Design a protein around this ligand. Structure first.
Ligand SMILES: NC(=O)c1ccc[n+]([C@@H]2O[C@H](COP(=O)([O-])OP(=O)(O)OC[C@H]3O[C@@H](n4cnc5c(N)ncnc54)[C@H](OP(=O)(O)O)[C@@H]3O)[C@@H](O)[C@H]2O)c1
Ligand SMILES: NC(=O)c1ccc[n+]([C@@H]2O[C@H](COP(=O)([O-])OP(=O)(O)OC[C@H]3O[C@@H](n4cnc5c(N)ncnc54)[C@H](OP(=O)(O)O)[C@@H]3O)[C@@H](O)[C@H]2O)c1
Ligand SMILES: NC(=O)c1ccc[n+]([C@@H]2O[C@H](COP(=O)([O-])OP(=O)(O)OC[C@H]3O[C@@H](n4cnc5c(N)ncnc54)[C@H](OP(=O)(O)O)[C@@H]3O)[C@@H](O)[C@H]2O)c1
Ligand SMILES: NC(=O)c1ccc[n+]([C@@H]2O[C@H](COP(=O)([O-])OP(=O)(O)OC[C@H]3O[C@@H](n4cnc5c(N)ncnc54)[C@H](OP(=O)(O)O)[C@@H]3O)[C@@H](O)[C@H]2O)c1
Ligand SMILES: C=CC(C)(C)c1[nH]c2ccccc2c1Cc1c[n+]2c(c([O-])n1)CC=C2
Lengths: 257, 257, 257, 257
């Protein structure tokens, strides 16, 4: 008797990192999960590793579709097709969007007009395209939810990441606009702090151990966030039929020191 | 394997409304719950309704204590007594504080020095006495949590409830200080919107019908919040081992209209 | 064309530090200023320092009265006395409240019920007593303003000042309620960061030099705040007839490092 | 003997509305002002109306440049040209950015990938291009400032304006990143509420008299905002050498009802 059992959850960005943990958490509650990513080989491994963790579950409750949401001529159709597949002959109950490139941007001296606009494709256009088309594949009711992702660097930005912190503030304001545009559907944002995903190990390279320590030190929990803890923020937003227009911040007290 | 199965949960203010729903939710995860309130027979009726809804659980896992937390002479000893009792032969894992007087304040013209300071006994002293004494009954680790209660009236005050909005802002700011003082234990706040508890009908009396309608209209969801929905925010904070220093706002989008 | 020329401004806490700079700044615009403080000796030095710096100004446009606003028997009378004096045969145009005890609080193992409530007299009751009685001495119009004082430690608390952070959080929520209670009169808050007042050397004593340069190092400006500069935040709120319900944070980027 | 005398102020977007009122305020303090807009006839009207209001002023203290910053081909080059002219034989002291198209966006039903990305050139790319090049034309010191513009719809979105609310959230978060990147130069944001500029009268058309009554009614001041009033927030940020990373919200208390 779990409230998320019959429910269909679409995770855009669920092939690795935080979004992948949300797929795992939703499956533990008995949900039907649809996963979206651009990497065909990450997509394939994601689905296999979830079936290994949940062998009881029907494989037809774990479906995956490949979309490159960074291409303007394709974002809109790939969003619509992923909404169609997540719905089946029913409607989607919850959508989660963690998808992002997370590659270090250029410094200020090399800043080009395309390096600013290119991230807005996946971070801004794709979520607005989800809102444009979700009414045909979702019921606009308070039991259904759309959740976007932001970060603590919206408020305490990292050096050289001003453009991405800008886009994190855009997602937060945007979610409030969508909570009105799509009312009574619920729209919220999760703002995570330092989460040790495999993408963050790639950006940091050989500076990974010096940045982890620092992160650890500049937090009240004295820890980095595990994807399985941050994933509970997304589950909470699916279960609280009264949460809309909010930011759920999970950052280990990082904003207090 | 649920992290809240063996866990000891102290709900200060769990005899009615939001706190009671938090006990039901915690028991649903199999937790051991200790309840605190001032009304001796609200105590035995609350406990009886949870044992009847969860006959699976041993009856010695639902315990209640009576405390008057509005009385400065006794606040500290009754807090220490409730903490000793909820810990048992073990330590406390999570504490939730929803306790509040819930009596209509005077309008500003008839403001008296006592009407300002008396609400601070249950709203400020009682949580600080918990923080003062919990290290002897709790492990200061990120797996443990203390959660206080705030409200949307901190940002959209309700005329003339300026004094109560003041204390909600104090609770939010005090929780951030406690996240520093009690680290690496986690301290957070839940800020509910309009929750139709049986207490709010007493405060409103015959103007309840009209208020409800206004509250449903000032929201994206077109409804008031159920206590069992808002209770999921408290459950989320117990399970997200990375959340500290944060505010979980569940208000139905009322801050957006 | 200066609109603070004919202006009557009451600065509660204007004998030293930030409040004193607001009196100096207001006098520079030619306003009539009334000062409130507890120290008798300090009051007559305050006015002597302003009359020498503004000798053209009629010395009767600089008045001071002594009140003990930490004092429950007298807070309301003293407030009514100061409002009556600043109004004269006219009305007060702007009120600024910087008054605070500025005494180091106890650590949390010796927290007393009185150490929680005793700061609340000057920080919460006195401004609420100003709001109660100001309608008889002010025109409730958008050209008039009430400005309270908070701090950046409301969001980044300083250990162990959790209680003082609580009251700063209360002042921020109280201002918003009073912006509604006293509409269309304007109510706002200034939240300063690190300002080297002579009181701050008293609190820290011999630890002053290790904290200053640590305050200077953990700021974007790399400097501590001058009472000159933060005083301009109060002047701004007096001149902007559209600012109400807001917090002016002047903190040198300290929430950014 | 005024702190803005002789000071060089660059106002990007100063031909109409809020920015023009900032130009007027600055000239009253004796600053040297450079005005930027795209409309050649608005620029020549700007300067003529400021010279008539300040005939004492040297005409060489009022300089104007025409730039279309909505086009990626020239935005960076034209920004550099505007910085070079505002610096002259000296360095720029303060930069203010109000520039934006202020044209109603399409409804969500017709949302196109280009309607989303196009406002980001003037709203995001141009400020980042200013930050990229201002160090050769400004001293990075706490007495100099860069101020951007946001809005109250970032927190209370206006229906159908979700995309613009996103960009205002991006500007608030980007200013914080720039307060870090440009340190110790000061970066802040002004977030205005409802200001009846001639651009707003254009969007509303025949709905102007019904929208003003709605704006005046959902405010504590019972008024729309004056451009003259809102401009004092920008002047304040130029004079407070301790303000950095902050948002000055001037909205008439609209976030409170
Ligand atoms: N890790 C942290 O500490 C942290 C902190 C704050 C905020 N965040 C934010 O949380 C979100 C996820 O972060 P993460 O650590 O979990 O990184 P991640 O593992 O790389 O997750 C990003 C997801 O987005 C997908 N994706 C990337 N590009 C795509 C594209 N063109 N089209 C479709 N899908 C695409 C990726 O799948 P494919 O690779 O298959 O395309 C991946 O599943 C990001 O917004 C991040 O900025 C992370
Ligand atoms: N309901 C809403 O819409 C709403 C909105 C925003 C914020 N809140 C806040 O959420 C919290 C709970 O609200 P609620 O609607 O659930 O009201 P509630 O049902 O009356 O819950 C209050 C709990 O605290 C206990 N309590 C009250 N006074 C006490 C005292 N002196 N000593 C010990 N225990 C005491 C009560 O038990 P006893 O009666 O036995 O004493 C009760 O269990 C409150 O802080 C409220 O201000 C509520
Ligand atoms: N300095 C900082 O870094 C900082 C940072 C954040 C917030 N703040 C807040 O800014 C405000 C002023 O700080 P400050 O540095 O300017 O300290 P300050 O110079 O000591 O100013 C405090 C004012 O309040 C008066 N006062 C103290 N006790 C009083 C009492 N019982 N009754 C009436 N008046 C009393 C004082 O006058 P008497 O001595 O004559 O009583 C004085 O004029 C305070 O609220 C402070 O909490 C300061
Ligand atoms: N008015 C309000 O109620 C309100 C509320 C919240 C936020 N805001 C924001 O405050 C800022 C100013 O608003 P406003 O009412 O003052 O509107 P406005 O009068 O239209 O001012 C916009 C300025 O930006 C210039 N501009 C527009 N496009 C340009 C382009 N491609 N290249 C160069 N300059 C360009 C305009 O000059 P040209 O016409 O010559 O190109 C004009 O001077 C905007 O960011 C607005 O969104 C306004
Ligand atoms: C948002 C646009 C509309 C058309 C709704 C609008 N409606 C109005 C009614 C009265 C006065 C001004 C307006 C405006 C202009 C305006 C207003 N606001 C912001 C902004 O960017 N532009 C940010 C917060 C308010």
């Amino acid at each position: 008797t779990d409230q998320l059992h019959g429910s269909r959850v679409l995770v855009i960005g669920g092939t690795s990192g935080i979004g992948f943990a949300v797929c795992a958490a939703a499956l533990g509650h008995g949900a039907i999960v649809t996963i979206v990513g651009s990497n065909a080989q990450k997509l394939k491994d994601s689905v296999a590793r979830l079936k290994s963790s949940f062998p009881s579950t029907d494989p037809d409750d774990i479906v995956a579709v490949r979309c490159d949401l960074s291409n303007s001529d394709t974002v809109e159709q790939d969003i619509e097709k992923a909404l169609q597949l997540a719905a089946g002959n029913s409607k989607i109950n919850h959508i989660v969007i963690t998808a992002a490139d997370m590659t270090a941007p250029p410094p200020l001296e090399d800043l080009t007009v395309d390096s600013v606009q290119r991230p807005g494709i996946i971070r801004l256009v794709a979520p607005l395209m989800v809102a444009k088309h979700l009414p045909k594949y979702m019921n606009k009711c308070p039991q259904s939810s759309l959740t976007l992702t932001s970060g603590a660097h919206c408020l305490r930005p990292n050096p050289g990441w001003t453009v991405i912190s800008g886009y994190c503030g855009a997602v937060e304001a945007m979610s409030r606009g969508l909570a009105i545009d799509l009312k009574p559907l619920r729209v919220n944002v999760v703002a995570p702090g330092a989460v040790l995903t495999e993408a963050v190990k790639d950006i940091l390279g050989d500076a990974y151990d010096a940045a982890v320590e620092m992160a650890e030190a500049k937090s009240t929990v004295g820890q980095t966030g595990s994807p399985e803890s941050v994933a509970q923020a997304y589950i909470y937003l699916m279960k609280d039929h009264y949460a809309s227009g909010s930011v759920v911040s999970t950052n280990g007290g990082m904003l207090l020191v």
